């Protein structure tokens, strides 16, 4: 039940998944789509998986190999191993394109009047960007805030490979009429310093 | 040829129970094993249990007490009885088929694996009930904040803005609320052009559109 | 009932020897045949062999490749497979049928009534 593991490639890449104890079986799965077979006992290929696909043993590992890499060959790869009554799936390899770095364009937006009346407030601070690794500080008064906020980011875009995040700082009306200046701190591989978009109420 | 239909799947209370069907058709049901695969949203793949028609049976330990597999021979479907759910059982739930003595079959240079898998059924548990979205204006966007359950479309002036347009994935609130932004990027001259974003909420009949 | 032995991870060109031990009241069974399935395939007759003549009767896909034997001093069948492809990776199971069919339907998996467990080959490239 974790959060699969990440892997730039480009198009033509040869790509090596190690799987870390009976054989292993590899799976390939699409965002929102059932997953599919691709090797079965180690190194035995599936019905319609193109040869590029290879599976081999090396000592006590089991590695899944990609000769040439393809455009429809990025998503996420599973190894499933079989003990003696469980079925276990490891942790996954999700496959992504490779692409140069790029900056963010930072927004904030106060929350409108329409929302103060209901009791609660929420900032939000918008980030296109690559690599995915990114942080976003929130900053009330100069004071850094931690826990009330929640990050979300897009899949990686089917024209220009970039990432797009928002982080929405939560907060009771209460609390929002208490202070003034509202600042959220963004850090990215792209930029050599941070950057700091931000507002008063 | 060989198809795997999933059925069943809803929202539940925590502490309730439902059952879910893998209606199989088009191969020797007795000559195969149905497995249950379920996936949280955005982890990995998670085996539940499985049924060799037999009823060689085995669960996975986070779900040994209050889960129950069986079958009918007759209707080549497999049935999985959940009881007790809880927040952790939230994900989406395949089922596939296998050998049908994978356990004897397994070695150490073999492993057939899963060869054909459903599209599997959603099943959420949760206490909350359902509720429409708050529509509010924020480039620029709309925040939809605080309705259960998935899912919504955010669409603008009806479709018609759909390049450069993002829509976040929903972030389940500590409330049991989802909540999402819809942003787009348009030209600064066309500001004083108007900007709607359409929301739809299907499971509460609910149709908000805000201009920004 | 019917255990198969033998097989494992074989190269491709190699040969393997299965063997299927049959225990109890054989003399009633009509045919002795081996089966395989594959992962996506649907389970296939490959070889059968008539008990009461010793006739055998193999699949176009197995021809001039596999033999099959019966050693009745001990009931046990034979499944020899020689020049190995990675197309035979399946799991070769030994099937039985006490009721009789004629030599068109030998080869199909609705006419035999007996399996064994299996045991799995791989032809590991
Ligand atoms: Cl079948
Ligand atoms: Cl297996």
């Known amino acids: 039940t974790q959060s699969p593991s990440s892997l730039s490639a480009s198009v033509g890449d040869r790509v090596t998944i190690t799987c870390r104890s009976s054989a292993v079986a590899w799976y390939q799965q699409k965002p929102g789509k059932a997953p599919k077979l691709l090797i079965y006992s180690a190194s035995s290929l599936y019905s319609g998986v193109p040869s590029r696909f290879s599976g081999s043993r090396s000592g006590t590992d089991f590695t899944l190999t990609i000769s040439s890499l393809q455009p429809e060959d990025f998503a996420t790869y599973y190894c499933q191993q079989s003990s003696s009554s469980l079925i276990t799936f490891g942790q996954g390899t999700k496959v992504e394109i490779k692409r140069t770095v790029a900056a963010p364009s930072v927004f904030i937006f106060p929350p409108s009047d329409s929302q103060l009346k209901s009791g609660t407030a929420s900032v939000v601070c918008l980030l296109n960007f690559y690599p995915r690794e990114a942080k976003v500080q929130w900053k009330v008064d100069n004071a850094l805030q931690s826990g009330n906020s929640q990050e979300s980011v897009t899949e990686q875009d089917s024209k220009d490979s970039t990432y797009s995040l928002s982080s929405t700082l939560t907060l009771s009306k209460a609390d929002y009429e208490k202070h003034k200046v509202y600042a959220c701190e963004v850090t990215h591989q792209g930029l050599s310093s941070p950057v700091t978009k931000s507002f008063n109420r | 040829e060989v198809q795997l239909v999933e059925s069943g799947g809803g929202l539940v209370q925590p502490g309730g129970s439902l059952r879910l069907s893998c209606a199989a058709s088009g191969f020797n049901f007795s000559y195969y094993s149905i497995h249950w695969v379920r996936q949280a949203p955005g982890k990995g793949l998670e085996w539940v249990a499985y049924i060799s028609s037999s009823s060689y049976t085995s669960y996975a330990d986070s779900v040994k007490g209050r889960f129950t597999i069986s079958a009918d021979t007759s209707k080549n479907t497999a049935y999985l009885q959940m009881n007790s759910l809880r927040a952790e059982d939230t994900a989406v739930y395949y089922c596939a088929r296998g050998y049908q003595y994978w356990q004897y079959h397994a070695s150490w240079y073999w492993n057939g694996g899963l060869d054909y898998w459903g599209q599997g059924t959603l099943v959420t548990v949760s206490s909350a009930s359902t509720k429409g979205p708050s529509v509010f204006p924020l480039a620029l966007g709309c925040l939809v904040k605080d309705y259960f359950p998935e899912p919504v479309t955010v669409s603008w002036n009806s479709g018609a803005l759909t390049s450069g347009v993002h829509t976040f994935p929903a972030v389940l609130q500590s409330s049991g609320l989802y909540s999402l932004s819809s942003v787009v990027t348009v030209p600064s001259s066309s500001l004083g052009q108007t900007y709607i974003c359409n929301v739809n909420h299907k499971p509460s009949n609910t149709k908000v559109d805000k201009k920004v | 009932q019917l255990v198969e032995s033998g097989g494992g991870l074989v190269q491709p060109g190699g040969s393997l020897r299965l063997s299927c031990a049959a225990s109890?009241?054989?003399?009633?069974?009509?045919?002795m045949t081996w089966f395989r399935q594959a992962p996506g395939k649907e389970r296939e007759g490959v070889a059968a062999?008539?008990?009461?003549?010793?006739?055998?009767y193999y699949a176009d896909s197995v021809k001039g490749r596999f033999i099959i034997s019966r050693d009745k001093a001990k009931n046990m069948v034979y499944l020899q497979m020689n020049s190995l492809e990675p197309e035979d990776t399946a799991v070769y199971y030994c099937?039985?049928?006490?009721?009789?069919?004629?030599?068109?339907?030998?080869?199909?998996?609705?006419?035999?009534?007996?399996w064994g467990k299996g045991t799995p080959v791989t032809v590991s490239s």
């Open positions: 099937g039985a049928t006490r009721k009789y069919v004629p030599v068109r339907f030998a080869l199909d998996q609705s006419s035999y009534d007996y």
């Open positions: 109890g009241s054989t003399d009633s069974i009509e045919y």
């Open positions: 062999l008539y008990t009461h003549t010793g006739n055998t």
